[PDB]
Amino acid sequence: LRLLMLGLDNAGKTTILKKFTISPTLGFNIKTLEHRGFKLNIWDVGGLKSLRSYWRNYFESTDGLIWVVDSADRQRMQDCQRELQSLLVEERLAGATLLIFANKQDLPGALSCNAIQEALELDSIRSHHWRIQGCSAVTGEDLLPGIDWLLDDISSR
Amino acid sequence: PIGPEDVLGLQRITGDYLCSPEENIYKIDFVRFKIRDMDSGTVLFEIKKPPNAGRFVRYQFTPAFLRLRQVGATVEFTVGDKPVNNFRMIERHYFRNQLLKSFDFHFGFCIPSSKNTCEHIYLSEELISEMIRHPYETQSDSFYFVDDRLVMHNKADYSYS
Ligand SMILES: Nc1nc2c(ncn2[C@@H]2O[C@H](COP(=O)(O)OP(=O)(O)NP(=O)(O)O)[C@@H](O)[C@H]2O)c(=O)[nH]1
Ligand SMILES: [Mg+2]
16 A cells, blocks of 8 residues: 655654654655555655746655645645645545644634535545544644544555 | 656665765755654654765664654655756665565655655564664665656664664
8 A cells, every 4th residue: 555645844754753853855655664564665855946846746655645735734734725626636646545634723823624525625526435533643643533534545456 | 767656666775876965956955854652752862964875874763663653754844946847755764675665655746845744743672683683684775756757865874773
């Protein structure tokens, strides 16, 4: 199994990769692991503006696409929506299950899951299975159950 | 120009380095390696560095190393100006010219000018006994390919006294 972890810079992708001393990722972080009786290969690719055109270089063979959102970054939700919808029309991601982590739920003005669901236009999606899941990546809160659901869904195929 | 299939059937450690360091026109540079006991969380080994002989490490492990249930191996490397397609590692481990383990890992695309990370979270009593008796006879060859072309060959031996 191959998982691809994307989202805008500063969303907490790398934090997630490490928790389930930290710096902006100018390139990638791979973590490779056994969990639920699967060999998981996970790529955390950087999200600053100029890395994004290189995202497509990790599309091929993806089973599971984790999209990570800074839920307090309300000025950039639409860019985040925009970035996400592109991915979903990309032929090389036709397979993938989509898991949205609505991260930084601890931050006072963290948008709710529902607010994020509306803002990201998740109901439009007709063609990938998905789940939105709040979490605080810094605490470790709500990550595994999120992933666990991802693997079960991928596992049905 | 050596390729993946050329090293997949090797039955012994190579007596020589299989490419010259000039082959490395991608300027792939390993700047950090770290090995962790996943049970106790002890760092077993760490080596850091900024940012045809190639690289060599003589590792100094304990007898307990060989009894561990789970270990984490981290690499960090920076890359030069050119893109790097199909980045790939094959690592083969031998004890007395008898293969022990082979790891074949497909990193994929490397973005020009990047710092990247890869973390991997990964034995008979007569094998353990002989390996503790015979330091530096455990040997490994690490081959790094780029679009099926060998660009880097690192070597290592190991102690478990
Ligand atoms: N308050 C809070 N901060 C978080 C949370 N998750 C991550 N952060 C913070 O967000 C900052 C950037 O996190 P990071 O994981 O590097 O984000 P990234 O998406 O991987 N960055 P890049 O895309 O540049 O690779 C760090 O300061 C980190 O502590 C969270 O749940 N709550
Ligand atoms: Mg990151």
